[PDB]
Design a protein around this ligand. Sequence first.
Ligand code: ZN
Ligand code: ZN
Ligand code: ZN
Ligand code: ZN
Lengths: 206, 206, 206, 206
Amino acid sequence: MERNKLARQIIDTCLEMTRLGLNQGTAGNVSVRYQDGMLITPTGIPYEKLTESHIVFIDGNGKHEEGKLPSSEWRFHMAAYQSRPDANAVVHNHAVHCTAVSILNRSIPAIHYMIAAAGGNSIPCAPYATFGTRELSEHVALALKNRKATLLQHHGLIACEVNLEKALWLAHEVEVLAQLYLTTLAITDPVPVLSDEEIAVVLEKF
Amino acid sequence: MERNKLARQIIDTCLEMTRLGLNQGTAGNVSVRYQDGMLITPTGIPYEKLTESHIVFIDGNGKHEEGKLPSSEWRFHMAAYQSRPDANAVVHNHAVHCTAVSILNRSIPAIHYMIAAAGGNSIPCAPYATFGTRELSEHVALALKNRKATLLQHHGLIACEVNLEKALWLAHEVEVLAQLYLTTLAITDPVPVLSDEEIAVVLEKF
Amino acid sequence: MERNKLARQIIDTCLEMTRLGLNQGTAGNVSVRYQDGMLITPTGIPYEKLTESHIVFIDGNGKHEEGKLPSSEWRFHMAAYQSRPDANAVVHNHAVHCTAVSILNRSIPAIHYMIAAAGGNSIPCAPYATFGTRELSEHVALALKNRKATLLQHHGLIACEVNLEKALWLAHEVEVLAQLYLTTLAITDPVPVLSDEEIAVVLEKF
Amino acid sequence: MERNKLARQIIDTCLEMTRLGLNQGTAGNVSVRYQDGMLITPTGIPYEKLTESHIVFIDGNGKHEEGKLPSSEWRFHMAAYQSRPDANAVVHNHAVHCTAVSILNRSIPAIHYMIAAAGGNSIPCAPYATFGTRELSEHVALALKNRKATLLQHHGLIACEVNLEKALWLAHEVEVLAQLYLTTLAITDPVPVLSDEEIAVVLEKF
Ligand SMILES: [Zn+2]
Ligand SMILES: [Zn+2]
Ligand SMILES: [Zn+2]
Ligand SMILES: [Zn+2]
């Protein structure tokens, strides 16, 4: 839990997301719980030009260290850590399939047993609100209360876990589930799902 | 047939599957027939962190060597080698297209002459059962009796052959067939197929 | 603003577009505003065989330096710089998703808040005209008057910005928007959109 | 035109096709016109294990040099060079999109002006016949009479040009056209096309 060791992982995660096809462009942001606040990527700086010195610290009051501009979405990373006290890392990206399902404004159902990875029998979709807005924060906070990941209507995906690699794994897993959903939904509607009872069993085995 | 030479190939195969886009995440497992039992990847350890020392040996009774946890699916690798005595390697993954067709719970038909590569005129889809369950084993064993590969409903794909590279080749081939199926089925239903007589001829030439 | 420093970026951009999957083959062309005219890639020379010496200079009259053949599309790069005086770089490619939407002859609507990146609430589609034609130039010039990017019916995409990297970023962003559009339109028609009022707000925050 | 310089390009082409996503597995074959016959890849040997020594020479009578097994499709490479005397290289692959359109048994229409690259206003689809069959040869020969590329029903794609790189470029271009076709056809049927008159003009400019 050294600011320097955290900064390095944060950039790695951004690089890994681009590497996995879960994000590209100036989209996305990542943070880790640090001290009273968190360490978060800065607004609009390409993952390729990022360095530990660019990572920003925001305290419990929302005070970011001077001369640095935190991610426009810092408020919903805030709400994420408050909604999920068990979570130490938040990952946000505009992954293609997760984003398309969010344009459709649909929760992703129990089409695969791995859905249980997000903590339940669905991946919810949170109502739209202007990006970097406080109202957007209320929407995600509410969605993450009982799920580890949530889609953002007309926006993207946000997943959080105990650490960055488990947070990245989860976000990656949701891109797979979102892709399985879009592919089968184009051929059939509704797409077959496992029953809630079955999901209960799978959650027991997890 | 040296434990060490086998361990190395097993990890390579996992790396190659990720490399080919046939698997990603903590999904998938691979094993080779070894002595009375088999050598199989361990449960939940990233392909990147895998080493020959992590590969687990399970004997004919299902006894895995102490201090090591075999893949949760070890039972259906077992059933695979019992159902197909001609097979020396099993590959399991959650490849995107194979998995979507399995959510649709459909066999993949004779849409391409390469379907004959799995031993017949179809790639079956085995009924769902909780992962790592003995009932799941009964389902795959039954499906592999007359086919070298089978989809797992709401789960993924399992392919086996005489060795790991032929097992990987086959699994890869089925991802192609599953992708040709999903793409044409979105435009037309039913998708045109070669006749069984034609498949018979192709099987003769193989 | 040295001819040599510009030539290098132009080739890089072509390489980066192939690298991002926004273009492949002998398709595409890129130019930068230079002196009274511009520096533009040459017609039909693989990005791999390109060198600073191949980059062509065309003056304000359309006079390209002797012994060099400029891109067949040089006329619409011309029209682009005249239509958008704020723009210093033009990028053209036959990116898969942008091109499919252009075959459908549709503008891309407000399906995502990033649509505002092109300057409005849509990505227009300019009427077809034979490639490398002066009439094609009139069509793009007209489309770029109030937008930074435009699709070309039955052809591809053209995006321009203040410099090559912002021009490449934008073109990349439009491939994402075009892909979100094609994926959701196959499942639903019309695809849900953000209201113009909302887009207005997002444009204010940009 | 040295056997050794040709062998090297042939393998490169196979490697490049896998690299571009136009082929994978043990599928595909490539040949160049050599002396009275041709040099062609051998049947069933992974592109990774190929060497100049594996390339096979078949004479005008179909006599392949001893101890070497030519590609099962050597007969249709033969027919290709006889149908198109202007062609010096043939490329065959089971590229995903070209193959799906061939399962649908459709010609690819004038959806993009680049269709003119294959010599006309369409990419035909040749009737199925067992692979490596003489009747399959009659089908491709007939299709290539007035086109440089043809799809093979329930099989794949075959493209030929004056040399391997122009043959690879063309095959790659057809994968793009086949992908634009499948994507728009899922949303609309029939997919809008340029008129034959327009294609005539484009063919004039080519
Ligand atoms: Zn965002
Ligand atoms: Zn599994
Ligand atoms: Zn163009
Ligand atoms: Zn073939």
